[PDB]
């Protein structure tokens, strides 16, 4: 059975997966995505280092391939990350002038979003903006533009494509008692109360064995910020226990504003942490017990 | 135990593999390439659709990543394919003017080769130019420019980087009695007699089970064209029988002008024909029997 179909039958929008051109032309990835998943995200092809490796020199071939494949196969598309220190080329982080950085950031956002205007359901606009203690991470954007870079990014994104749902994303939001989780919720509440157009919080969910249960409490806390949507993104679980995966799915089901879940690849050998076999299909492209456990949960 | 080291000890240049950025950041590919392979090729990142998606506007992010990684890790680099109908964007195949297409082709060759001048051992300049009956394939280049497109491509490439070995590549050159095999020999002999700088013939070797034995006769026939080098490229073998792989390796060893062998990926799940499990490492990144058989053959 298709986990995307089953999650839609439970009132959710999608079960998604990260992919890119050379996954779609190898292995069994295309067949599995066509049958079992409802939304695709670019694993790498929309990051800043992939799309604007030198100023104004945009590289869209990989992203274009993904968008076209998704449209021809009737899949939703997520995009990102527009503003993320981790995939930033050196030409950006060397800028020290506030006006120039504001305009470089705006141009990067606008160019990417305009190119795919109307085709992208979700954009991850700002990623990993928080330190573990809940303060704002001191990236080039914070240091040079100041704390208004987040309002600016979201206002710019809403203008570039008013159809898209605009998300902030972060990791280590998996426990309700962790300071980072409470910090992002209270900042998003205040931003939205001042009119910043943050439509969603996306939780980059990279779990160790046994950590799925904590998401059942963390995700309702993220939803308390009052955004229209929340999502689980980049999901993988070391060991791929059925218990951990089913707990994450049930957290999604329990939270009315949680629109769906995206797993960070199809098959274990193509994972960034392949030795932890953390995905739902094995190296032979066979569904693993965690896949079947999700199916059986969603049927009930 | 490294098949590249062992083939170098037998007097050859390399045992190589095709890869690209998102293979190097996932799985165990980087570790295996570091330990066991001596040359890397771009699986996709130097093809025309990837590098020049609109006229004169070049995308280098993916290819730059691979070249940098190879230099950091002491590996040789192959590049290609500069002129190949199978990865051609639509803007090229809609040109009908001979001068314009000639200039477009020359600019594509010169721009890529200049960017990496001195860093690339081998360039595959022209690919898949022959029909199965040995006539020239009627691609946009043949239809618009005529058969001079092949001489022009090679002369342009030699001027752009005189350090690089320049190859023509084709597939189905695996049997000495197949018409295509003798046809490429006939034409390469004629082009070299006219001063065209074709340094190598690269045989894109996609075998079915039991076809390795025929390479023992086909590869010496390809070498009879008199090029300084020949190579085995894009190698994969359905079923990955040790006998097939060893026969291909011994064909290389038997042909003085054969500089090396490149396999078309690391692990089975990442193959274009993964269901045929045709590579040297399995879906758990373990070396398969064919890998160990190559090790023993190179020591014997
Ligand atoms: O959910 N995702 O797998 C995913 C992948 C890449 C991304 N970049 N930004 N947001 C992303 C989400
Ligand atoms: O040998 N190769 O694997 C390989 C891969 C891609 C290519 N493009 N042109 N030549 C190529 C060789």
Numbering used by the authors:
A (entry chain B), B (entry chain A): 4 to 303
Kindly provide excerpts from the paper associated with this entry.
One of the key active-site mutations occurred at position 50, which was mutated twice during evolution, first from lysine to histidine (HG3 to HG3.3b) and then from histidine to glutamine (HG3.3b to HG3.7), resulting in a novel catalytic residue ideally positioned for stabilizing negative charge buildup on the phenolic oxygen at the transition state. In this pose, the acidic N–H bond of 6NT that mimics the cleavable C–H bond of the substrate is located within hydrogen-bonding distance to the carboxylate oxygen of Asp127 (2.5–2.6 Å distance between heavy atoms), while the basic nitrogen atom corresponding to the phenolic oxygen of the transition state forms an H-bond with either a water molecule (HG3), the Nε atom of His50 (HG3.3b), or the side-chain amide nitrogen of Gln50 (HG3.7, HG3.14, HG3.17). In addition to being held in place by these polar interactions, 6NT is sandwiched between the hydrophobic side chains of Trp44 and Met237, which are part of a mostly hydrophobic binding pocket that also includes the side chains of Ala21, Met/Cys84, Met172, Leu236, Thr265, and Phe/Met267, as well as the backbone of Gly83 and Pro45. In addition to adopting a cis conformation, which is stabilized by hydrogen bonding to an ordered water molecule, this peptide bond also adopts the trans conformation in the structures of 6NT-bound HG3 and HG3.3b.
Over an evolutionary trajectory that yielded the HG3.3b, HG3.7, and HG3.14 intermediates, a total of 17 mutations were introduced into HG3 to produce HG3.17, resulting in a catalytic efficiency increase of approximately three orders of magnitude.
